[PDB]
Amino acid sequence: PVTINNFNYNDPIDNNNIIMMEPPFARGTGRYYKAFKITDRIWIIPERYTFGYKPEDFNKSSGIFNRDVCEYYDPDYLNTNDKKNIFLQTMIKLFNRIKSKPLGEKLLEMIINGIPYLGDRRVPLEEFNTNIASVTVNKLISNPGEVERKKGIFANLIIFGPGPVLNENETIDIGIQNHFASREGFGGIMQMKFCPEYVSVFNNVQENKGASIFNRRGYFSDPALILMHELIHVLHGLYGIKVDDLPIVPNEKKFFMQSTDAIQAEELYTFGGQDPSIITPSTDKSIYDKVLQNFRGIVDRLNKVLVCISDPNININIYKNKFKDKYKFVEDSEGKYSIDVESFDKLYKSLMFGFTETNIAENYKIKTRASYFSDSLPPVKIKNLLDNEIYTIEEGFNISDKDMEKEYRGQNKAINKQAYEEISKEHLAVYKIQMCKSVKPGICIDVDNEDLFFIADKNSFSDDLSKNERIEYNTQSNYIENDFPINELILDTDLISKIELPSENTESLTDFNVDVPVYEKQPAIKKIFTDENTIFQYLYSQTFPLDIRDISLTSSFDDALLFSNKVYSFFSMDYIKTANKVVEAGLFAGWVKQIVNDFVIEANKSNTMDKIADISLIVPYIGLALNVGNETAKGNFENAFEIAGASILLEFIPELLIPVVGAFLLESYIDNKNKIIKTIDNALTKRNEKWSDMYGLIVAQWLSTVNTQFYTIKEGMYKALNYQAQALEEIIKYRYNIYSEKEKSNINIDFNDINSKLNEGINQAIDNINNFINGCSVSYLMKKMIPLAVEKLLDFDNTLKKNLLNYIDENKLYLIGSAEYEKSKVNKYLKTIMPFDLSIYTNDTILIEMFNKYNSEILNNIILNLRYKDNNLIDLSGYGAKVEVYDGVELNDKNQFKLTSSANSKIRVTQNQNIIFNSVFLDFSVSFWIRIPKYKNDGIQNYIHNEYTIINCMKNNSGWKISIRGNRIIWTLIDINGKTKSVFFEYNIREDISEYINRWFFVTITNNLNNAKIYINGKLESNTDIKDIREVIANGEIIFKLDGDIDRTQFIWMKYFSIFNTELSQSNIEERYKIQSYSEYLKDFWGNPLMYNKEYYMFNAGNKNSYIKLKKDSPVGEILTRSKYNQNSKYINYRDLYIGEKFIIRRKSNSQSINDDIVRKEDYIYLDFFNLNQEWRVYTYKYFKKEEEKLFLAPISDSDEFYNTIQIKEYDEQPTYSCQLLFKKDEESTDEIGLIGIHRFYESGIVFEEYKDYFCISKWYLKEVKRKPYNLKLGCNWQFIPKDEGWTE
Amino acid sequence: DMFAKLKEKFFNEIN
Ligand SMILES: [Ca+2]
Ligand SMILES: [Ca+2]
Ligand SMILES: [Ca+2]
Ligand SMILES: [Cl-]
Ligand SMILES: [Zn+2]
């Protein structure tokens, strides 16, 4: 157990627990500080840290010390004895809080017991030397007024009060002659400057759900956690493992890049959580190895140390044993110390990955920021940490007794208001960038440096991957996982030293040599000019001065910059008008409701105006709100995102470090088979290490150059929504207060309710924004980063293949009967890429979830997606396949394309070579729509027997093809040996009415480990076992082109061709079918859009073989029976489609207007037809008294005894080409008269009798249309058949 | 407009 000593500032000096210390940077020059021993080896000097600072710099000035920190100055802090006492007692309270749980007690125990080595790098191996400033500190033990008499004490930590910037706590190590014992294995006296009441503030914008009610309102930090974070640094310093290696350095070469000090891995390790993943495996190992060598230095010193030159009372064997314990060395029977590589590895991992801020916060139930890189809000002052109503040893602020344990409510700025005060911004200094508008005294926006985008410089990352490797029989693989089981830390009964501390008393320090760092302020503002109007500018435009009276919203960014009363908004044109609408007294409460509501709807937009697009998550107003990236506010953002994806949001596209992996040199073992096989096995194991290290390298870059940009975009959206809210609130308040005092009494309005309604809608919007942006980020990783690494990893593999194969062949003599087992070990192993798993490189559950969400969104499996977007097909997948459409290919804007019989009627897709690699175990699907013409009646055997290819993906006589043979559609896989597999779908050609011949249908072929399958229109049609073939090379060019022996007249139409890098499930396919079947417009029989002013024959789904004919003597439609195919052939049969009357759909109105000739559901039409060189029309009698009645077909007239108005309906919700025709009173009324269909009617009477079918209206149909599933066979289901080149009869 | 001609024929068809 750790004991905290108690004392008061004014207690007498006892030369034991209360001393006058001469601290390391005081330099033996001058002056001494009353110091208090809080626990063994740890001291508190409750006074300002002055070392390296000038007195003036303790005042707020026009400059700042660091460029991130919002800096608070108070030169009076700690200027009285009583203040100094409060400091002491707060530290005692904080220490008590820290030791209130094992994890924290153990932190302190490790720190207490981790005494610095009695020397440093300058000291002979055979000597301990205590007379250095990193080891001994002096206490002045003479009385006041007397000649100075000093004795030395060993110490581990000295904690000071703050320097000039109260809220910038800092742990500092002692450099002597330009080297640091605490970075070279020895450790040394550690120093801290700390302030307990001026705490950091942070928010959690970036996480969802989050908080049952009051997120995301800002949180203040528990100074116990701030303290422990710094104590972690002390821990690393005392064990001498606080080493330098390659840091993270920000790129600073554009105006929008955040400028900051270099970041050592040790800082990211200290914070923990996701931040260690920014340190690459390469550098993790580099640091590990440095610390190991450093410890090899100490163990050797320990085997050699003989004397202490500076303190004869030191007992060599006592200290040798304490250091053995500190460093976890082992001792043999001869008393020789060595490194046990396991005890080292455990000690290391526990010190760097066990004790982290992230882990302590989790264990202590303290909330903290999500990352070293998170935004900050300005610091706040904790009124009284000594008040157990506010802050307690056991629970910090989050006191369950005050209902503050749940959700860290006790840290929430919006709930625990009585715990903190804001600091007057007169005392705060912040580094800002003043961005003044230029174009290719003006408008100048002040932006905090830390609000800018953090982008790591390419020099941030290790290229060790490029080094060669030496593969021996005993070669091992190195993985430093950045993780430590926190519960086992807590229960490791070997972790904490059982060796007593030696006496702290020693001889006086007489060598004061030490480097004291010197600090200076720099200007708080940097003025720059820029032509750019990105996030900071777009945000600024959404603000407005306090003293104004009558703000209005605008969509004109420029107007917003010019005029003080105009505030920019990214909501609809239309929100904006409602926002600006001035109403009378009585209508005001209603309007306040509408607009607060409209706001919430606007903020919640999360879908994509076009529904076929293949985007899961989007929030469409992000472009308009920030203009971040590539002019995202100009043009339709949704459209821009469809074309170019997550990239369009990035302000900077970083250049990746992707080293060429170094070659392997395989060692030789003349005469040892066992060592040859082990060298092979070791080579393959090492290959996995290089793959993994490379992925780890991509992840480090992703998180510190891309995911940071996206984070900044999340924060921006939080502010933008909040500005829009604030604006509307001001608009409402202003308009309310214009009203007469009486009018205002009869107007019921709650500003706290309005405020909390909007505040909710923003949190809903930010959940969607988080999901979208997170998705964008993973997308950039997976599409623009990982594949470029995989390209080089495959090179590496292919070089290693050659290498290992040559080696097996050179040593074949010693592989007596094993050479072909080993050839196939190597070939099989290096045939498949190592798959990328983000959980190997982090255990931040946020990131892992991001990544799992992505991988289970089927649309992210699309590796080819050809769509039309400008005359032209292009690949929307995100993998940038090259697409060449040649002149003989007909393209329309319904996404259709026609491959004909011409040489120039072809499309060439050149696939991205870095994502199809997956090749022995197939796992991919292909989907598209096709329209294949009817056979030609006279050329029937060529149809039946001649196979032609339509899409062909072959490289070296291996790959896949879709071919057609008459009424059959065929998928073929061809392996590297030419072994073949097939699956096909054949539609009937002897059917009265075919659902497939010359009509768009949807095909999906899926390939997995054991099956190739064809789906048609969502349904599984057939299937072929494909286990028995080998490797299929699926990365050739895809060539869309008719290739066989076919007529000039032969052609094919396709749309929506796409390829997925996984086997689609039935659900997936059925979804895609439904999705791709959807249209605002109705369709004709063939599946093309239904059109006005276009000749159509009529077909009835309920009476397939029936067609309408104007009765001879009469003005009614009789039903007849379609003629059959009338010819010799036994291979085919069908019913004629081009018969009955030639109908045409006319617009009732064209008004308002529009502007194109496509027919849409709910349109109002006249159904006309041609007769005797005239246009006639289909009416119904107004007053028919039965449930069904003959329709009336007669020339055009407005007779008030017949309805002519027809509304065109599609009652079926599943995909269909049938539509219905409903007769209405007129365009205005809701009264429904009946539906056009076919009914039988009684023919009189004295002659012979019978029933006979007629074109009719019926009320009965209307009673079934809302039933589900919709009956496809009802007689009111019509389809329109225009003449088509794909059908000849 | 010889249409009442048709009307009448229609009315006799339905009756
Ligand atoms: Ca790492
Ligand atoms: Ca930033
Ligand atoms: Ca303005
Ligand atoms: Cl309806
Ligand atoms: Zn730190």
Coordinates of N, CA, C and O and ligand atoms in Angstrom, one line a residue, chain A residues 258 373 375 449-454 711-712, ligand 2:
Chain A
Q258 N -2.7 22.4 -39.9 CA -2.5 22.7 -38.5 C -1.0 22.7 -38.2 O -0.4 21.6 -38.5
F373 N -5.4 14.0 -30.8 CA -5.7 14.9 -32.0 C -7.1 15.5 -31.9 O -7.5 16.2 -32.9
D375 N -10.2 18.1 -31.1 CA -10.3 19.5 -30.8 C -10.4 19.7 -29.3 O -10.7 18.8 -28.5
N449 N -5.6 28.1 -34.8 CA -4.8 27.2 -35.4 C -5.3 25.8 -35.2 O -5.3 25.0 -36.2
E450 N -5.7 25.5 -34.0 CA -6.1 24.1 -33.8 C -7.4 23.7 -34.5 O -7.6 22.5 -34.7
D451 N -8.2 24.6 -34.9 CA -9.4 24.2 -35.8 C -9.0 23.8 -37.3 O -9.8 23.3 -38.0
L452 N -7.7 24.0 -37.7 CA -7.3 23.6 -39.0 C -7.1 22.1 -39.1 O -7.2 21.4 -38.1
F453 N -6.8 21.6 -40.3 CA -6.7 20.2 -40.6 C -5.4 19.7 -40.2 O -4.4 20.2 -40.8
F454 N -5.3 18.7 -39.3 CA -4.0 18.0 -39.0 C -3.7 17.0 -40.2 O -4.4 16.1 -40.3
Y711 N -12.3 14.1 -39.5 CA -12.7 14.5 -38.2 C -13.0 16.0 -38.2 O -14.1 16.4 -37.7
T712 N -12.2 16.8 -38.8 CA -12.3 18.2 -38.8 C -13.7 18.6 -39.5 O -14.3 19.6 -39.1
Ligands
CA2 CA -7.2 20.2 -36.0

